[PDB]
Structure 1
Amino acid sequence: TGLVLLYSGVFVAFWACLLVVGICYTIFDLGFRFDVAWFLTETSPFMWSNLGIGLAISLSVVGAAWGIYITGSSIIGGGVKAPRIKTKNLVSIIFCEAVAIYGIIMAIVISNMAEPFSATDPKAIGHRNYHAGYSMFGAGLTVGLSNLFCGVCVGIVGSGAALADAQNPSLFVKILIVEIFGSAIGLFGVIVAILQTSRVKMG
């Protein structure tokens, strides 16, 4: 592997700096200089909030587009000898496209609750406002990344069902139940996402 040596050469190196930077903050006295409080407070509540709206739709469709091309190559691959697959097995495309709907439904919801203010001090920016910031990041993270994983889930099973239906016509309606449990995780993403943004209000 050539290009994998770059990421595995940086991740070991960056962790090796942060290890020895870590045993040189404690060992002198300089743990007061670390300040995870100053990192979460002084930056913004908007950098977390606006990233979460972006990661809500974008990381869902990067699983939805991932789910399409895995089984879309297997539709046209088996479709050469068995052309009857092109009508029945398009629901495998839909279940790896309805995951993108779960993002865009959520992404409008999280953007509906973001509102500006005038404060610039982390004591003026109250805990009602900072909690509104991270909750958009967390709910945008769990509707984006979980939809990525259920997007690749139904796509891989969709590629296998396109190959199994090429050999036998009666099989595809039996393997379709596997794609339901794969696409059920997309349903499990949005229930968390609205619940993390239920009690949230900015201002």
Structure 2
Amino acid sequence: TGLELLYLGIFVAFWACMIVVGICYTIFDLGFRFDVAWFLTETSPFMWSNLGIGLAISLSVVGAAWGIYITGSSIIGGGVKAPRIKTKNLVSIIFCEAVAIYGIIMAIVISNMAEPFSATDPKAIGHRNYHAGYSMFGAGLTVGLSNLFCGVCVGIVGSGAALADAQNPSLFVKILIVEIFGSAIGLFGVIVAILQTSRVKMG
């Protein structure tokens, strides 16, 4: 658990530092320096928007790959004694990849809303552009993380389904319903991302 120890140490140190820093800023009357407004505002909307698109695609692909390996290991292991698994349970892989297809679709939809400003002063950048960056970032987070979780869930369920099919052929047809239910979550994330970026306009 060396790497987990390192991560836990970093987390604890960072958040102890944050606690003491917040106590200092509040108590020493230096709160006006902790300008979250200035952070969110000076930080360019392009950073948020492009991080959002990148996350939308990358996390969707991460979930698709996670599920694909989770279920393909089981498919190939079971098929050593019952090769029909390879031909039948490719549907789990298909779902895990539909996750990434949703990811790219939403990356396209988000990227279609990008446009330069030609301004640097926040009053010039305006609510429209700032909210556009924030909402593209949020939509990317939504789609990417929902797709990641849906892909992992479908992969786990598909590994289970492949293992169960390796022993009795008539079970996969009934266990695919769990895969469908797990797939619905990616669709929900896509719908929410689309709603978020519905009225988004950079320029």
TM-score normalised to structure 1 length: 0.99
Tell me, what secondary structure is at the counterpart of 1:185? helix
| Cα deviation 1:123-172 (Å, max 9, x = unaligned) | 11111111111010000000001100000000000000011001101111
Partner of 1:138: 138
Q: Write out aligned runs for 1:144-183 (5 A).
A: 144-183=144-183
Q: Following the alignment from structure 1 to structure 2, what is the Cα–Cα distance between the partners of residues 42 and 166?
A: 57
Under a length normalisation based on structure 2, what TM-score does the superposition of the two structures give?
Answer: 0.99
Structure 2: 5+ residue runs without aligned partners? none
Structure 1 alignment gaps of length 5 or more: none
The total of aligned residue pairs comes to 203
CA shift, 1:87, in A, is 1.0
Rounded to whole Å, the distance in 2 between the matches of 1:163 and 1:198 is: 42
Q: Is 2:80 the partner of 1:111? A: no
What does the per-residue CA deviation read over 1:27-53, in whole Å, with 9 as the maximum and x for residues that have no partner? 111001111000000121111011111
SS in 1 for 2:122: coil
Shift of 1:26: 1.0
Which 4+ runs in 1 deviate beyond 3 A?
none
CA RMSD of aligned residues (A): 0.6
Is 1:80 the counterpart of 2:80 in the alignment? yes
More helix by share: 2
Please give the per-residue CA displacement for 1:47-87, whole angstroms capped at 9, x wherever unaligned. Answer: 10111111111000100000100010001100000111111
Q: How far, CA to CA, are the matches of 2:43 and 2:2 in structure 1?
A: 38
Residues 84-120 of structure 1: CA distance to partner in whole angstroms, max 9, x if unpaired? Answer: 1111111011011110110011111111110012111
**2:167 and 2:117 mapped to 1: Cα distance?**
62
Partner Cα separation in structure 2 for residue 101 and residue 58 of structure 1: 11
